[PDB]
Design goal:
The structure is cut from a larger assembly and holds nine protein chains of eight kinds. By secondary structure, chain F is mostly helical. Helices cover about 75% and strands about 5% of the residues of chain F. A three-stranded antiparallel β-sheet of chain F has the order 1-3-2. In chain F, a hairpin with a 5-residue loop joins strand 2 and strand 3. Chain F starts with a helix and ends with a helix. Chain G is elongated and about 65 Å long. Chain G is α+β, with helices and mostly antiparallel strands. Chain G contains one helix and two strands. The longest helix of chain G has 24 residues. The N and C termini of chain G lie far apart (about 50 Å). The chains are: A mainly alpha, C mainly alpha, D mainly alpha, E mainly alpha, F mainly alpha, G alpha+beta, H mainly alpha, I mainly alpha. Strand 1 of chain F pairs parallel with strand 1 of chain G. The PDB classes it as hydrolase.
Chain lengths: ~140, ~70, ~60, ~475, ~30, ~400, ~50, ~260, ~25
C-alpha cells in the first residue's frame, strides 16, 4: 500500500525452502503496487529460480519475469517466463502483463525469419516454449 | 548522371506510387535544369496508368519555364 | 481488444489473439516515433538546401 | 454573481480547451511540440486562464462546457474539489456546489472540442477518446499547484484518470506527464501516507509500451520525493538506477529532479556529486512554478556546499527576493567563513529538526567537521610554518590538545596538503604552489574548454529545429 | 539561437490558439 | 551650492551626531519646496541607516517636518505655472524656437528643486530640440545629476549618466566638464570604486571656479585621501606628496599630510592608526562612501604589499615592529589577501622569516583568469536552458 | 616601479631578480577570451529572462 | 504475534528478565528460523488493525537478532537484520516502537561502523525516525562515535560508553577500536614526521607505544629509534603538476581533434 | 562578519597602542 517491500526481499534470500515459498507468493500480488524497490532487488528472485534446493522453480521464475518487464526490459522477462515452464499461461491470461507473451512472438519472428529462407525452419536458435506460443497464436 | 538517376527511381517506386513526388521534388531544385527534365520523366512513368494530384502540380511550373 | 480486462484461456479461445492485436498496435506506436522524426530531419536539410538553390538559380 | 459568471466561465473554457485538444489530435511531432507544450500550453492552462477573469473556480461550468468523463464521478468534481473548505482551497465561487452535475445547462454545442456527453465519453481502446478526456483532466489538476489543495485529489478526482486511460497514445503521454506531477503533490504537501504508488506505477506500464521518454521519466522523479519524506528510505534509493530524463521535459520537472538526487548522494557521503546536481537545479529553472520550489533548493544548498569544503558569502544569498527562507542560513555561512567551530555545530544541531522531514538530518552530524577543515585551508595556503597555538585561537578550537588531532584529519584527504608536527607544535605547508610551470595553466583552461562543448552541441542541434517546423506547418 | 528563436517563440504563442481556426482557413485557401 | 545639501546629509545618516544635524539638513529642501519626492527619497539614502526625513526614526530623535517646506512648494509651483502659460501661448504666435526655450529652462529649474526626476527629463528635451547655445544647453544637465545623487541610488544615477554622456559631446564646452567631473566623482566614492573617484577629484582641484561645489575647503581635504586609495606608493610619492599641484590646490589636509608620510617613510605603524581615524572624520561626514569595506581592504593591502613587494625577506621581529599591528592581527588580515595571490607571501613563525614569492610570471596573470572564469561559467549555462524552453 | 622586477633579500644582502617574462601568448589571450564572452552573455541573459 | 511459546516468549525473557542461557539459545536458533513465516507477515502487509500486532511480532525477531551476536553467528544476524529493516518504519504507522527496539538499534549501528560501512550508517539513519521515541543512551555511542571520528578527534572516540547493556555490546567495542586505529595510523603516516616512544599512544589511537613500533616494521615506517614515515608520504600528494602534453584530462591529440568535431 | 570595516576601526587603534608599548 504504502508498506515497504524490504521485508519480502529479505525473505527470498533466507536458507529455508519454506520461507522462500511464502516470499514469492506475497511478492507476486503486490508487484503492480510496488515496482520500485523490487526492480533493483530482482537479482535475488532470479537465483531462486536457479536453485534446486528450492521446490518452487515455476513460481520463482514467474515472479522475476514480471519485475523485469516493470523495469522496462522486454527481453529479460522473456528468458525467465520460458524458464518457468508452466505458469507462462497465467501471464497470458492477464492483459496488463500480456506484454511478455506478445513480445515472445515478436522475438521469435526475428529468429525464424533467418531460418525460414531456404525452407520454413524454426531450426536451432529457437527453444520449445517460444516455438509453442507462436503456433498456439 | 543526375538527370538519369531521377528517372529510374520513379519506376522502382511505382509499386507505392505515392512516394515518388516527395523524392523527385528535392532533386528538381538543383542548379542544373538537366535534373529537372529527368524529374518530369520520373513522375510520368510512375503515374502512367493512374496518377496522383501531387504528380500533376509538380510538373506544372516546368511547363511555364522558358528553358526549352 | 484493450490493454485492460483479464480473462482465462489462451490456447484457442481467441481473447488472447485479440489481446495481441492491442500489442500489435503498440508495435506501430513504436514505429510512429521513428517516422515523425525522420520527416522533421529530412525537412531540416531541405530548408538549408532550398536556401542554397535560390542563390545559384538567381 | 451567478448570471455573469456562467457566461464568462464558458467563453474562457472553450478557447483554452479547444487549443489544447487540437495539438494532441494532430499527433506528437517532437520538435514542434517541445516549444508548444513548454511555454504556451502549460502556462495558459495553469496561470493565465484559471486565476484571472471570473473567480478562480471556473470548474462548475467546466464540466458542462465539455465532457470530463462519462460516469457521474468525474461530473461530480464539484463535490470532490469544492467539497473541502469553501470552494476548495481557492476563491469562493458563485456557481452551485451540487451532487452529480451543477446546474443542468449543457453548453456542449455540436462542436467537437465542446464535446457532447454520450458522444466523446466511452474510454475507448482507440487512443483519441482518452486523449481529449485527459486534456480536460490536465486543466483541473494543474490548478492544484496554484491552490495548494489537500485531499481533493487524494480521493477520486484524479484516481479517475486511471479509468480514462486504457490503451493511451504516445502523443498523450507528453501532456499526461504534467498531470502526473500534480497527482503526487496533493498527498506530498500535507505529507499524507496514502497510496501514491498505485496510480504512478499504473502509468509506468503504459508509458513503456508507447515509447515516450517524458512520461516514464517524470514518474521516477515524483516517486523519489514521495518516499524520501515518508521515511521509506530503501525504495527511494533503488529507484534512481532506471535513469531517464529527456530534454523535451519541462523546466520545473528538471529542477525537482536534480534536487531529489542531490539529497540521496549527500548522505551516501558524496558531497562532491551532491553539490553539483543541487547547484544545477537552482540555475536551470528560473521559471515561475520554480519559485515555490527554489526556497527548498536554497535550504539544502547552503548545508551541502559547506560540507564539501567551499565557502559562499552571506551577501550573495540576501539579495534575491526569496530572502525570507535564507535568513537562519546567514548565521551558518558566517560561522564557517570566520572559522568558528563552536558556533556552527550548536546552531545546526537545533536546526536539524526541520531537515528531518526531508531526510537531510543524517548530514547535520557530519557538518561539525567541515568548519575546522575550511579553517585550516585558509591558514595552510597562506603561510609556510605557523605555530599550533595561533591556529587554535583563530579557528575557535576546543583546546590546544583537540587542535592537533582535528587538523590532521583534514590533511589526510589531501585538499589541505600539509603535515602537522605534534611534538614540535607548528603545521607546515607542503604547498609551495604556483601555476608558473610548463603545462599547468592549460589544465586550468581545459575544464572551461570542456564545459563549452556541451553548450555548443546542445545549441547547434536545438537552434535549427523550431524555424524549419513553423515553415513546415503553421508559420504565423 | 536567441536571434532566430525570437521569431519562433512569438510564432509559438500565436500558433497554438490559432490551431482550430486555422483548419477553416487552410481548407478555404486550398479549395481555390 | 545645491551640492551643499549633500554634504550636510551624510551627517544625520552616519553616527557622529544624529539629531542636531537634521534641522540644518532639512532647511535646504525646505526653501526648494521638495515635498512630493521627499518621503520616497529618505528610504533610498540609507546604507548606514538613519533617515534624513521625519518618516522614520532609526538611531535618535528625528527633526520634524516643517510647514514651510509645504508652503514654499505650493507658492513656487503656482508662480512657475502662471509665467509659463503666457510664454507657451505667445510661442505659437511668434518664433517657436526662442520663446519656448527661455520658458522651458526656467520651468526645468523649479522641477529639479522639488526633485521631480521625471519632470526634469521632460523639461530638458524640448529645449534641446529647439535652438539653444551650446554652453547654455550643457549647464541644464547638472540639475538632473544633483537629484540622482541626492536620491543616492546607484540605479538612478546610472540612467542619468548615460544621458549626460550623449549630451556633453554635442556642445563641446570644457568649463561645463569640470562641474560634470565633480558629480561623477561623488557617485564613485558612493560605490566600491574609489579608484575611479580619485582621478576625477584630482584633475578638478588644479583649475576650478566656484560654481556647483559644496565648499572648496572640505573638497580639497577630501581629494587627497581619495588619491591614496587609488594610487600605490611609486605613483603616490611623486604626484600628491612632492608634486607642484598640491601647493596650487591649497592646504587644508594635515591629518592626511601625516598619512601620506607614513607610507613614504616605510614606517607603517602610524598608517594603520590614521586609517581608523580617517573612517570616523571624513567618510561618515560625507554622504558618499558606502561599502566602506572596500576602502579598508584596499588601504591595508597597500601598506602590506609595498613592504612585501620590495623585500623577499624580512625577519619577523623587524616586520612586526614596522607594521605596528599585533601579531595575530597582521596574520589574519593577510590571510584573505594571500588567497588572491597578487601579493602572494608566506609567514614563518618557527624560522622567523617572512617570505615573498613575488610572481611577475605566468602565475600572476593566470590567477585572474580563474576568477573571471567562474562568473562566465554560470552565465553561459543559465542562458542555454532558458532559451531551450 | 617594475624597472627590473626583483625582490630584495635582506636576510643575505642580495638582490634576487625574478625570471625573464615566461608568459606564453595563448595564456595571455585566455583572460581576453573570457572578456569577450562575458560581455555578450550578460547582456543577453537579462532579456532572455522573460522566456521562462 | 504471540503464538507457540518456547521460541516466542521464552526467547525474549532469556536476554531481558531472566539470566542469559546460551545452551538453551543454540537449539532455539534453528527453531527461530521456522517462526519467521508468521512473524514477518505483520510488516509488508500492514494495515491499521495490524498496528498492535506488529509490536508483538517484532520482539521475537529483534531479540533473536541480538542473540545472534551473542551466539557468534554473523550470517544468522545478517539474515534477521535484513527483515528488521522493513520494521523501522512501515505503513502510515504500525508503531515500530518496542522496549528492545532501542537495544536492537545500538548493536546495528555499531556493526555498521565496525565494518567501515560508513555510507550505510548514513543511508539507514534517515529511514530510522522511530528512534527519537527510544532516546539516545545506547544510541548515543554510535552517533557520537561517528561524529568525533569525522571531526578527527582522537580522545572523544571513546568506547567507555556503549557497554551499559553489555550482553553483546562488548563485541562491537573490541573490534571498533581496532578498525578505527588503523585508519588513524594511515592519517598519521602523512601527518607527522617522527615519533619517539611516548606520544605514540594518542596520535596513532593505538593501545601502546610497543605496538607503534610493531607496525613500524609492517609498513616500513621505522628509521632509527623513531620513525620517518612522513617524508615519502607527504611528497607523493602533489598531482596538480602537469607534464608536457595534457594527458590528465585526456591525451592532447585526441582532445584537439574533438574540439574541431563539435563544430 | 558582513563587513570588516566597523571592526577594523577599533582594531588598528587598539593593536598599535599595545604593540608599540611592548616592542616598537
Amino acid at each position: 500500500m504504502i508498506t515497504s517491500a524490504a521485508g519480502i526481499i529479505s525473505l527470498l534470500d533466507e536458507e529455508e525452502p519454506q520461507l522462500k515459498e511464502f516470499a514469492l507468493h506475497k511478492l507476486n500480488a503486490v508487484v503492480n503496487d510496488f515496482w520500485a524497490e523490487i526492480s533493483e532487488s530482482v537479482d535475488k528472485i532470479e537465483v531462486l529460480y536457479e536453485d534446486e534446493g528450492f521446490r518452487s522453480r515455476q513460481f520463482a521464475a514467474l515472479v522475476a519475469s514480471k519485475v523485469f518487464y516493470h523495469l522496462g526490459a522486454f527481453e529479460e522477462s522473456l528468458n525467465y517466463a520460458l524458464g518457468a515452464g508452466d505458469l507462462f499461461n497465467v501471464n497470458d491470461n492477464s492483459e496488463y502483463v500480456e506484454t511478455i507473451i506478445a513480445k515472445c512472438i515478436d522475438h521469435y519472428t526475428k529468429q525464424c525469419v533467418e531460418n525460414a529462407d531456404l525452407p520454413e525452419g524454426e531450426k536451432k536458435p529457437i527453444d520449445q516454449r517460444l516455438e509453442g506460443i507462436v503456433n498456439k497464436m | 548522371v543526375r538527370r538519369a538517376a531521377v528517372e529510374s527511381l520513379g519506376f522502382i517506386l511505382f509499386r507505392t506510387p505515392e512516394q515518388c513526388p516527395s523524392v523527385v521534388s528535392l532533386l528538381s531544385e538543383s542548379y542544373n535544369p538537366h535534373v529537372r527534365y529527368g524529374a518530369a520523366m520520373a513522375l510520368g512513368v510512375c503515374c502512367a496508368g493512374t496518377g496522383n494530384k501531387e504528380a500533376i502540380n509538380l510538373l506544372e511550373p516546368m511547363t511555364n519555364d522558358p528553358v526549352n | 481488444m484493450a490493454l485492460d480486462g483479464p480473462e482465462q484461456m489462451e490456447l484457442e479461445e481467441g481473447k488472447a489473439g485479440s489481446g495481441l492485436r492491442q500489442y500489435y498496435l503498440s508495435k506501430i506506436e513504436e514505429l510512429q516515433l521513428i517516422v515523425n522524426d525522420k520527416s522533421q530531419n529530412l525537412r531540416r536539410l531541405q530548408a538549408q538546401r532550398n536556401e542554397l538553390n535560390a542563390k545559384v538559380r538567381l | 454573481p451567478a448570471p455573469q459568471d456562467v457566461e464568462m466561465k464558458e467563453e474562457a473554457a472553450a478557447g483554452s480547451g479547444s487549443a489544447g485538444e487540437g495539438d494532441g489530435k494532430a499527433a506528437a511531432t517532437e520538435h514542434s511540440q517541445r516549444e508548444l507544450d513548454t511555454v504556451t500550453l502549460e502556462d495558459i492552462k495553469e496561470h493565465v486562464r484559471q486565476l484571472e477573469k471570473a473567480v478562480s473556480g471556473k470548474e462548475p461550468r467546466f464540466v458542462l462546457r465539455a465532457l470530463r468523463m462519462l460516469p457521474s464521478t468525474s461530473r461530480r468534481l464539484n463535490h470532490y474539489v469544492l467539497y473541502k473548505a469553501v470552494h476548495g482551497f481557492f476563491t469562493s465561487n458563485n456557481a452551485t456546489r451540487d451532487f452529480l452535475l451543477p446546474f443542468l445547462e449543457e453548453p456542449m454545442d455540436t462542436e467537437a472540442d465542446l464535446q457532447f456527453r454520450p458522444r466523446t465519453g466511452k474510454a475507448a481502446s482507440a487512443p483519441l477518446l482518452p486523449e481529449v478526456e485527459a486534456y480536460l483532466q490536465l486543466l483541473m489538476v494543474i490548478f492544484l499547484m496554484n491552490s495548494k489543495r489537500y485531499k481533493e485529489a487524494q480521493k477520486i478526482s484524479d484516481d479517475l484518470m486511471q479509468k480514462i486511460s486504457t490503451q493511451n497514445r504516445r502523443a498523450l503521454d507528453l501532456v499526461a506527464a504534467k498531470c502526473y506531477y500534480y497527482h503526487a503533490r496533493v498527498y506530498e504537501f500535507l505529507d499524507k501516507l496514502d497510496v501514491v504508488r498505485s496510480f504512478l506505477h499504473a502509468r509506468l506500464r503504459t508509458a513503456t509500451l508507447r515509447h515516450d521518454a517524458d512520461g516514464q521519466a517524470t514518474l521516477l522523479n515524483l516517486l523519489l520525493r514521495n518516499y524520501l519524506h515518508y521515511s521509506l528510505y530503501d525504495q527511494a534509493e533503488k529507484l534512481v538506477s532506471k535513469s531517464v530524463f529527456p530534454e523535451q521535459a519541462n523546466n520545473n520537472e528538471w529542477a525537482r529532479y536534480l534536487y531529489y538526487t542531490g539529497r540521496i548522494k549527500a548522505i551516501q557521503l558524496e558531497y562532491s556529486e551532491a553539490r553539483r546536481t543541487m547547484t544545477n537545479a537552482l540555475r536551470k529553472a528560473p521559471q515561475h512554478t520554480a519559485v515555490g520550489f527554489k526556497q527548498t533548493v536554497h535550504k539544502l544548498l547552503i548545508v551541502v556546499e559547506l560540507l564539501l569544503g567551499e565557502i559562499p558569502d552571506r551577501l550573495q544569498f540576501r539579495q534575491p527576493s526569496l530572502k525570507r527562507s535564507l535568513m537562519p542560513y546567514f548565521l551558518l555561512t558566517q560561522a564557517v567563513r570566520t572559522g568558528n567551530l563552536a558556533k556552527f555545530n550548536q546552531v545546526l544541531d537545533q536546526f536539524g529538526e526541520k531537515f528531518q522531514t526531508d531526510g537531510t538530518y543524517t548530514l547535520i552530524i557530519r557538518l561539525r567537521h567541515n568548519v575546522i577543515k575550511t579553517g585550516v585551508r585558509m591558514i595552510s595556503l597562506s603561510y609556510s610554518r605557523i605555530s599550533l597555538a595561533d591556529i587554535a585561537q583563530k579557528l575557535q578550537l576546543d583546546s590546544p590538545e583537540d587542535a592537533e588531532f582535528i587538523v590532521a584529519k583534514a590533511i589526510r584527504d589531501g585538499v589541505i596538503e600539509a603535515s602537522i608536527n605534534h611534538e614540535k607544535g607548528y603545521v607546515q605547508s607542503k604547498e609551495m604552489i604556483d601555476i608558473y610551470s610548463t603545462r599547468e595553466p592549460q589544465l586550468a583552461f581545459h575544464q572551461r574548454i570542456s564545459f563549452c562543448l556541451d553548450i555548443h552541441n546542445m545549441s547547434v542541434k536545438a537552434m535549427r529545429f523550431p524555424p524549419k517546423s513553423y515553415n513546415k506547418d503553421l508559420e504565423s | 539561437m536567441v536571434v532566430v528563436y525570437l521569431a519562433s517563440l512569438i510564432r509559438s504563442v500565436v500558433a497554438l490558439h490559432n490551431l482550430i481556426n486555422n483548419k477553416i482557413a487552410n481548407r478555404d485557401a486550398e479549395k481555390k | 551650492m545645491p551640492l551643499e545639501n549633500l554634504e550636510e546629509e551624510g551627517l544625520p545618516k552616519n553616527p557622529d551626531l544624529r539629531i542636531a544635524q537634521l534641522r540644518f539638513l532639512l532647511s535646504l529642501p525646505e526653501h526648494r519646496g521638495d515635498t512630493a519626492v521627499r518621503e520616497e527619497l529618505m528610504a533610498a539614502v540609507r546604507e548606514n541607516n538613519m533617515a534624513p526625513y521625519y518618516e522614520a526614526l532609526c538611531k535618535s530623535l528625528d527633526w520634524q517636518m516643517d510647514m514651510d517646506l509645504l508652503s514654499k512648494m505650493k507658492k513656487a509651483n503656482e508662480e512657475e505655472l502662471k509665467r509659463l502659460d503666457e510664454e507657451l501661448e505667445d510661442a505659437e504666435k511668434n518664433l517657436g524656437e526662442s520663446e519656448i526655450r527661455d520658458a522651458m529652462m526656467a520651468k526645468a529649474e523649479y522641477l529639479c528643486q522639488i526633485g521631480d526626476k521625471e519632470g526634469a527629463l521632460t523639461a530638458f528635451r524640448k529645449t534641446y530640440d529647439k535652438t539653444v547655445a551650446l554652453g547654455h544647453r550643457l549647464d541644464i544637465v547638472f540639475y538632473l545629476l544633483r537629484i540622482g545623487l541626492f536620491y543616492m541610488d546607484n540605479d538612478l544615477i546610472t540612467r542619468n549618466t548615460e544621458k549626460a554622456k550623449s549630451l556633453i559631446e554635442e556642445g563641446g564646452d570644457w568649463d561645463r566638464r569640470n562641474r560634470l567631473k565633480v558629480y561623477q566623482g561623488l557617485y564613485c566614492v558612493a560605490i566600491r570604486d574609489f579608484k575611479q573617484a580619485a582621478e576625477l577629484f584630482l584633475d578638478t582641484v588644479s583649475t576650478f571656479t566656484s560654481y556647483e561645489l559644496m565648499d572648496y575647503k572640505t573638497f580639497v581635504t577630501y581629494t587627497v585621501y581619495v588619491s591614496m586609495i587609488a594610487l600605490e606608493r611609486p605613483d603616490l610619492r611623486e604626484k600628491v606628496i612632492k608634486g607642484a599641484e598640491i601647493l596650487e590646490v591649497l592646504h587644508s589636509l594635515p591629518a592626511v599630510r601625516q598619512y601620506l608620510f607614513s607610507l613614504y617613510e616605510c614606517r607603517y605603524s602610524v598608517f594603520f592608526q590614521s586609517l581608523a581615524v580617517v573612517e570616523q572624520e571624513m567618510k561618515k561626514d560625507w554622504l558618499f562612501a558606502p561599502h566602506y569595506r572596500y576602502y579598508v581592504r584596499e588601504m591595508r593591502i597597500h601598506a602590506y604589499s609595498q613592504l612585501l613587494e620590495s623585500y623577499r625577506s624580512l625577519t619577523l621581529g623587524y616586520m612586526a615592529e614596522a607594521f605596528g599591528v599585533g601579531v595575530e592581527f597582521i596574520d589574519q588580515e593577510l590571510s584573505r589577501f594571500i588567497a588572491a595571490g597578487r601579493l602572494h607571501c608566506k609567514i614563518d613563525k618557527v624560522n622567523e622569516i617572512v617570505e615573498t614569492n613575488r610572481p611577475d610570471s605566468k602565475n600572476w596573470q593566470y590567477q585572474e583568469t580563474i576568477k573571471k572564469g567562474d562568473l562566465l561559467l554560470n552565465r553561459v549555462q543559465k542562458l542555454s536552458r532558458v532559451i531551450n524552453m | 616601479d617594475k624597472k627590473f622586477h626583483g625582490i630584495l633579500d635582506q636576510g643575505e644582502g642580495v638582490l634576487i631578480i625574478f625570471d625573464e617574462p615566461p608568459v606564453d601568448k595563448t595564456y595571455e589571450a585566455a583572460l581576453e577570451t573570457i572578456q569577450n564572452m562575458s560581455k555578450v552573455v550578460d547582456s543577453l541573459y537579462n532579456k532572455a529572462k522573460k522566456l521562462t | 504475534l504471540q503464538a507457540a511459546a518456547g521460541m516466542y516468549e521464552q526467547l525474549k525473557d532469556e536476554w531481558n528478565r531472566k539470566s542469559p542461557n546460551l545452551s538453551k539459545c543454540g537449539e532455539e536458533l534453528g527453531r527461530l528460523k521456522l517462526v519467521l513465516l508468521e512473524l514477518n507477515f505483520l510488516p509488508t502487509t500492514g494495515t491499521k488493525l495490524t498496528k498492535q500486532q506488529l509490536i508483538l511480532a517484532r520482539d521475537i525477531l529483534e531479540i533473536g537478532a541480538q542473540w545472534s551476536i551473542l551466539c557468534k553467528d554473523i550470517p544468522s544476524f545478517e539474515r534477521y537484520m535484513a527483515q528488521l529493516k522493513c520494521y523501522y518504519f512501515d505503513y502510515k504507522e504500525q508503531l515500530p516502537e518496542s522496549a528492545y527496539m532501542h537495544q536492537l538499534l545500538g548493536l546495528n549501528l555499531l556493526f555498521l561502523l565496525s565494518q567501515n560501512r560508513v555510507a550505510e550508517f548514513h543511508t539507514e539513519l534517515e529511514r530510522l525516525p522511530a528512534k527519537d521515541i527510544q532516546t539516545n543512551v545506547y544510541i548515543k555511542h554510535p552517533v557520537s562515535l561517528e561524529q568525533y571520528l569525522m571531526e578527527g578527534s582522537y580522545n572523544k572516540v571513546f568506547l567507555a560508553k556503549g557497554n551499559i547493556p553489555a550482553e553483546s555490546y562488548t563485541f562491537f567495542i573490541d573490534i571498533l577500536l581496532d578498525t578505527i586505529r588503523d585508519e588513524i595510523a594511515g592519517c598519521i603516516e602523512k601527518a607527522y614526521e617522527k615519533i619517539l616512544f611516548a606520544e605514540a599512544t594518542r596520535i596513532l589511537f593505538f593501545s601502546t607505544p610497543k605496538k607503534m613500533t610493531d607496525y613500524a616494521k609492517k609498513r616500513g615506517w621505522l628509521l632509527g629509534p623513531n620513525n620517518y614515515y612522513s617524508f615519502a608520504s607527504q611528497q607523493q600528494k602533489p598531482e596538480d603538476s602537469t607534464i608536457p602534453s595534457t594527458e590528465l584530462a585526456r591525451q592532447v591529440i585526441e582532445y584537439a581533434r574533438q574540439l574541431e568535431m563539435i563544430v | 562578519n558582513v563587513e570588516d570595516d566597523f571592526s577594523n576601526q577599533l582594531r588598528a587603534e587598539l593593536e598599535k597602542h599595545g604593540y608599540k608599548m611592548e616592542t616598537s
